[PDB]
Amino acid sequence: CPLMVKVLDAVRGSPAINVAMHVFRKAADDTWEPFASGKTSESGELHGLTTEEEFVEGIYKVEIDTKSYWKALGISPFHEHAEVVFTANDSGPRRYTIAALLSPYSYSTTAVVTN
Amino acid sequence: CPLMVKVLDAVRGSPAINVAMHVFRKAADDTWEPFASGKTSESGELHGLTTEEEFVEGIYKVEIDTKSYWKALGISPFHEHAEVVFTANDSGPRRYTIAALLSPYSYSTTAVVTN
Amino acid sequence: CPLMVKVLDAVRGSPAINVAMHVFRKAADDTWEPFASGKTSESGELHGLTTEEEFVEGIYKVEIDTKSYWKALGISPFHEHAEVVFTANDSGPRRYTIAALLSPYSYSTTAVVTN
Amino acid sequence: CPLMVKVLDAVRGSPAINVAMHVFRKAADDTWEPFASGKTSESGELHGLTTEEEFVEGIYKVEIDTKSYWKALGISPFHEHAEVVFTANDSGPRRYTIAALLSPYSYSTTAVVTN
Numbered sequence: 001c002p003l004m005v006k007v008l009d010a011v012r013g014s015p016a017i018n019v020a021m022h023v024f025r026k027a028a029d030d031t032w033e034p035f036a037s038g039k040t041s042e043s044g045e046l047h048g049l050t051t052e053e054e055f056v057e058g059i060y061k062v063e064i065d066t067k068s069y070w071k072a073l074g075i076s077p078f079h080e081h082a083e084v085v086f087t088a089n090d091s092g093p094r095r096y097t098i099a100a101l102l103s104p105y106s107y108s109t110t111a112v113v114t115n
Numbered sequence: 116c117p118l119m120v121k122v123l124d125a126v127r128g129s130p131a132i133n134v135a136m137h138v139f140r141k142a143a144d145d146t147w148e149p150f151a152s153g154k155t156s157e158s159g160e161l162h163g164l165t166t167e168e169e170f171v172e173g174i175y176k177v178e179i180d181t182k183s184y185w186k187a188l189g190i191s192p193f194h195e196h197a198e199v200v201f202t203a204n205d206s207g208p209r210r211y212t213i214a215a216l217l218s219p220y221s222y223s224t225t226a227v228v229t230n
Numbered sequence: 231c232p233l234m235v236k237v238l239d240a241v242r243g244s245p246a247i248n249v250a251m252h253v254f255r256k257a258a259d260d261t262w263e264p265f266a267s268g269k270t271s272e273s274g275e276l277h278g279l280t281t282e283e284e285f286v287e288g289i290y291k292v293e294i295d296t297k298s299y300w301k302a303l304g305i306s307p308f309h310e311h312a313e314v315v316f317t318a319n320d321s322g323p324r325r326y327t328i329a330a331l332l333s334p335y336s337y338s339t340t341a342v343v344t345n
Numbered sequence: 346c347p348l349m350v351k352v353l354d355a356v357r358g359s360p361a362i363n364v365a366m367h368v369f370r371k372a373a374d375d376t377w378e379p380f381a382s383g384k385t386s387e388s389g390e391l392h393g394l395t396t397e398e399e400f401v402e403g404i405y406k407v408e409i410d411t412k413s414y415w416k417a418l419g420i421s422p423f424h425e426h427a428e429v430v431f432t433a434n435d436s437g438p439r440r441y442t443i444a445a446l447l448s449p450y451s452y453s454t455t456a457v458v459t460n
Contacts, residue, residue, distance in 0.1 A: 011241060013308055013335030013458045059195060078201055078226040078243055080174060085195040101455055103333040105243030108223035110446055111193045113358045126356060128343045128423055128450030193358055216340055218448040220358030225331055228243045289425060308456045310404060310430040316423055338453035341423040
């Protein structure tokens with residue numbers, strides 16, 4: 001499992017559950033092609049988006065639907081989504097854990113990259 | 116002006132100076148239409164991006180070129196750039212300060228919205 | 231003045247107004263000696279805490295009463311307060327802006343140090 | 346395991362390994378009494394600090410020695426340490442995961458509290 005995304009709710013101090021996200025990969029013609037998608041579990045984690053073989057070198061974008069998350073909780077947030085755009089595997093295969101920490105008017109994203 | 120961006124460097128403890136960014140407005144065909152850009156001053160701030168009359172309701176994107184900033188400092192970054200996407204003015208005109216706090220493998224974006 | 235504190239509210243997307251804080255300097259017996267305090271203005275800023283002549287080298291602590299802030303908004307917070315502890319002026323006099331970004335179950339503190 | 350602390354390095358995008366921390370509990374006479382201590386593992390996690398039985402209601406402080414971490418990597422950071430001060434178990438036993446995200450001039454702390 002070379003790509004994992006974890007999402008936390010900084011208002012409730014809890015995992016952000018059932019958060020939808022879509023992953024895209026930049027194609028040769030410079031457009032965003034749909035790569036993978038899923039929803040966070042009860043632990044706020046989304047595993048199994050891709051495989052070592054499929055997750056080749058490229059520029060990837062993860063668009064996390066934070067607006068729907070907040071709206072469902074009664075909140076009109078600032079951001080439409082939280083985005084992570086990154087070049088992956090440019091020095092060989094790596095494991096990526098993307099952490100998103102959510103507040104109604106602020107988010108942070110962090111990457112932990114391991115061998 | 117109704118939009119200001121401030122950028123800070125969490126490695127050096129300083130304003131992030133000469134950081135380039137482009138501002139886009141989502142078009143009817145939902146492509147992104149560029150409409151403003153600039154680079155942060157010596158105080159890490161970018162003002163004068165738009166005016167009250169131009170800054171109408173819509174979905175806006177600020178694309179901050181964080182990668183080039185880290186490149187210039189000789190530090191390996193994770194993200195291609197830092198994309199702040201938000202619906203503007205949804206209630207009516209507001210003043211927006213977008214604050215971006217940068218680290219090589221993490222960033223946060225916060226909005227301060229005043230009326 | 232050589233020390234300024236700015237506080238932002240990540241739930242409301244606003245300056246955090248009327249946030250109380252105390253500043254301490256570590257004494258010889260390594261107890262904390264209070265020496266300044268105040269509350270954030272309507273811009274979320276607290277200025278005039280000290281002067282260039284008073285702000286000598288040493289270890290300083292800013293104790294931000296985040297709990298009372300969240301209490302006043304009717305929101306359950308995690309932390310008792312947000313303690314910024316730093317060695318000042320270690321090279322010589324600097325100007326410090328401490329920026330605190332607050333959520334109920336998360337906070338970040340960043341220093342902008344200029345010379 | 347009712348208390349866990351995880352520490353990440355936002356410069357390298359990696360767990361922050363061998364980071365020392367000390368936990369204190371506020372006594373009846375309002376002083377800080379030593380409660381527990383340890384170092385983060387290769388995963389940047391510190392488990393086993395306490396037990397359900399021992400971890401009674403109280404005000405707890407975790408002081409994470411971030412300065413030694415950065416110094417060992419050649420960096421003179423802003424903060425002396427990262428602190429987490431919180432009331433625990435005031436509504437019955439809870440599980441606490443404290444996440445610290447470290448940069449030389451900035452840190453964030455987040456709590457995930459579960460049943």
